[PDB]
Design a protein around this ligand. Structure first.
Ligand SMILES: COc1cc(-c2cnc(N)c(-c3ccc(C(=O)O)cc3)c2)cc(OC)c1OC
Ligand SMILES: [Cl-]
Ligand SMILES: [Cl-]
Ligand SMILES: [Cl-]
Length: 242
């Protein structure tokens, strides 16, 4: 449980994230590096409590945080977590834009099912760059214009998460967010009228309908996590598999 127990293989992104290999058994992992050296004791107490709660989240659709390593020599904190070889959803969406190719409805149903179960777990106790893919088609929740801001949270709620999920699934389908604008104020205007284009016609009316419900202006009209999973679109094979 010290940094020397792992070899860095290479940097994923820049704190900073790195793909690492545990020496004892060759297990591929990643860590996130936080420099606390510029933090106060109150800020560091916050950081430790937060990290300790992250350690508790054990769920197949949430990024698993295994360990925390302190290198007081560097004043660097390392959060060691599972490696998701598939990258994040943001890159999937970008790939699709680039290669002019829409994502499979089956893939979208997998994201919808597994992300909804992730939220369900969070509520029991959201953007593409915060959604990760493993090697076996599993989706995991981890960790500028606020494209996904819900109407209500734009004024002063578990139904706000549903809205944000709706925006994410929408953008997975259309390869663009449901409400776009050049300024934030234009954005807010668009979000308030609550109008948007149908996802592309290659997607079934049933898929269109549930994404559209999640994007209702009134939070009480949005489906709950439980109503979402009850939908006939959502089958066993859309769930996680080891
Ligand atoms: C395909 O390469 C990429 C991998 C990742 C990536 C892989 N595993 C991870 N655990 C993470 C990751 C998950 C959560 C957090 C957090 O909670 O702060 C941090 C990292 C990421 C990511 C990529 O792009 C962002 C990759 O593409 C090069
Ligand atoms: Cl296209
Ligand atoms: Cl399809
Ligand atoms: Cl269209």
């Amino acid at each position: 449980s010290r940094a020397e127990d792992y070899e860095v293989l290479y940097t994923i992104g820049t704190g900073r994230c790195q793909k690492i290999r545990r020496k004892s058994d060759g297990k591929i992992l990643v860590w996130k590096e936080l420099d606390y050296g510029s933090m106060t004791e109150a800020e560091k107490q916050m950081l430790v409590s937060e990290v300790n709660l992250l350690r508790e989240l054990k769920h197949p659709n949430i990024v698993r945080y295994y360990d925390r390593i302190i290198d007081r020599t560097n004043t660097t904190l390392y959060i060691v977590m599972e490696y998701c070889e598939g990258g994040d959803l943001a890159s999937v969406i970008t790939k699709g834009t680039k290669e002019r190719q829409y994502l499979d409805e089956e893939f979208v149903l997998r994201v919808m099912t597994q992300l909804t179960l992730a939220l369900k777990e969070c509520h029991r106790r959201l953007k593409p760059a915060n959604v990760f893919l493993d090697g076996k088609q599993n989706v995991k929740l981890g960790d500028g214009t606020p494209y996904y801001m819900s109407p209500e949270q734009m004024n002063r709620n578990e139904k706000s998460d549903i809205w944000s999920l709706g925006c994410l699934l929408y953008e997975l389908c259309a390869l663009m967010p449901p409400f776009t604008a050049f300024s934030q104020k234009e954005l807010a205007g668009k979000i308030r009228e609550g109008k948007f284009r149908r996802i592309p016609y290659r997607y079934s009316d049933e898929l269109n309908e549930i994404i559209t419900r999640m994007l209702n202006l009134k939070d009480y009209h949005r489906p709950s996590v439980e109503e979402i999973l009850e939908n006939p679109l959502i089958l066993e094979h859309h769930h996680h598999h080891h």
